[PDB]
Amino acid sequence: IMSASFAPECTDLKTKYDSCFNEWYSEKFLKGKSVENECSKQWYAYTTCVNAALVKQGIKPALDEAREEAPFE
Amino acid sequence: IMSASFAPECTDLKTKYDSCFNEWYSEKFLKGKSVENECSKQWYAYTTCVNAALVKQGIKPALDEAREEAPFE
Amino acid sequence: PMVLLHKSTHIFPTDFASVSRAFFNRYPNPYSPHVLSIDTISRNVDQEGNLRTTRLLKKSGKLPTWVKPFLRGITETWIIEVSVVNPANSTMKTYTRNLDHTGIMKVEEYTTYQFDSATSSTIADSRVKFSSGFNMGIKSKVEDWSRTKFDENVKKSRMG
Amino acid sequence: LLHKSTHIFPTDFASVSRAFFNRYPNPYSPHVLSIDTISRNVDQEGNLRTTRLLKKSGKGITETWIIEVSVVNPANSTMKTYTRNLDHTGIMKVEEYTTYQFDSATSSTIADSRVKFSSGFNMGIKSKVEDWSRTKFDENVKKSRMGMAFVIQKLEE
Ligand SMILES: CCCCCCCCCCCC(=O)OC[C@H](COP(=O)([O-])O)OC(=O)CCCCCCCCCCC
């Protein structure tokens, strides 16, 4: 099986965002070849799917806050 | 009012022993006049009474154990 | 509050590229049945040039009944996993701790990945820190009582 | 652990020391229900060795047994005293070292008091939650690490 998103309705748009990333990670970002997010599409799909579901999630406020902190002081 | 013994039936035996001791302690022992039990009769009558009452006290084992220890090391 | 640091090291027989990737795609795997979902909340490349990534994960667990009554109905935690990847010096930092339940306790996990130019290895440095929802108060509050209650008992008994 | 208090009795040694042996009963310690002398003798050094048993009330269970032990040195005007509850030590053990020593230049008896509190059942805890973390930590660091190994291996096949 693959990695589930917390929103079962995004598990897929997720998988794809992931795939193009691994490609852009290993083959481009890691080798200095990076250039203009070769995945606007896949990300946006997934990232807007997950954001929709997140607002209904009580954990969101806690997550936002945690995103403000810098654990790497 | 004199201090009682944990065992009511010895309070009097203790009163008599203590009185004897206080005299022996202040007038003899502290003035370097005696290092012996000049209260033997009161002490033995009293201590016989107490030990008899301790054999029936749940705290005996703990007491026996504590008597073997040397706090001042 | 109360804290308990734990460190431990591990060396991987592969490069930074190989290991880092596995980090990002570590789920699912033989010993992760408790990991339910992982999402990539946000990713990007800073002014510095490193990959900045925040991922929300949700792991499950079975509370020990004999110490679980008090706590309501809870069989799972939300976790945040922030990370940084420096493509230059081939190193990646990975902070990661719980988001909900910080009330009872709060676990934190700093793990770093350094590639050892020489040994073809990627060294991973894990530091875990437990803390507590609680504890700030009493004992100290209390102690002091023991301090004064005796500061009084000695002085009180003294007089007599 | 500790409690360092000091007091001075503008009295001599024979007075302060006799008092200690006859401190009970008194209005400041109504909780003291009884005190008994378990053993008393003069060791080979000429010092009065005593060990007494007191029962103290306070707030089924309710009371505590305290052991008292003392050593009186008539040669240098010193008196060492020790007290510690006999029961309930698992929960909290309270130890008290108080020494009375006569000072000639001030004609007063100085009392030094040290009080140690020590709980074993407490510490037993401090130790389990400690082990619990080392365990939960150790176990999981092993797993996660082997997760990464697998994920890495297959990703190479
Ligand atoms: C009162 C209860 C509070 C529980 C709070 C738990 C907070 C954990 C925060 C830190 C999690 C984390 O980043 O640690 C990394 C490891 C990674 O191991 P794995 O998940 O890859 O096997 O993750 C783990 O293996 C550790 C967590 C595994 C158990 C998760 C239990 C979730 C809570 C269940 C009770 C509510």
Numbering used by the authors:
A (entry chain A), B (entry chain M): 4 to 76
C (entry chain B): 0 to 159
D (entry chain N): 3 to 61, 72 to 169
Give verbatim excerpts from the published study on this entry.
Although we could not obtain good diffraction data of the Ups1–Mdm35 complex with POPA suitable for high-resolution structure determination, we successfully determined the crystal structure of the Ups1–Mdm35 complex with DLPA at 3.20 Å resolution by the molecular replacement method with the Ups1–Mdm35 apo-complex as a search model. The crystallographic asymmetric unit contained eight Ups1–Mdm35 molecules, and two of the eight Ups1–Mdm35 molecules contained a DLPA molecule in the pocket while clear electron density was not observed in the pocket of the remaining six Ups1–Mdm35 molecules. Structural comparison of the Ups1–Mdm35 complexes with and without a bound PA molecule shows the r.m.s. differences of 1.2 and 0.6 Å for 169 Cα atoms of Ups1 and 73 Cα atoms of Mdm35, respectively, indicating that no significant conformational change occurs in Ups1–Mdm35 on PA binding. Interestingly, some of the Ups1–Mdm35 molecules without clear electron density of DLPA in the crystallographic asymmetric unit had the Ω1 lid swung away from the pocket. The bound DLPA molecule is completely enclosed in the pocket of Ups1, with the phosphate head positioned at the bottom of the pocket and the acyl-chain tails oriented toward the entrance of the pocket, yet leaving some empty space in the pocket. At the bottom of the pocket, the positively charged side chains of Arg25 and Lys58 are close to the negatively charged phosphate group of DLPA, and side chains of Tyr26, His33 and Lys58 are within the distance that allows formation of hydrogen bonds with the phosphate oxygen atoms. The hydrophobic acyl-chain tails are in contact with hydrophobic side chains of Thr76, Ile78, Met104 and Val106 in the pocket. Besides, we found that the Ω1 lid could take an alternative open conformation that provides a wide space rendering the pocket entrance accessible to PA. Since the size of the entrance of the pocket is about 9 Å in diameter, which is too narrow to allow two acyl tails of PA to pass through freely, PA binding to the pocket may require opening of the entrance as well as a swing of the Ω1 lid away from the pocket entrance. The closed Ω1 lid may be important for preventing the bound PA molecules from slipping off the pocket, as well.
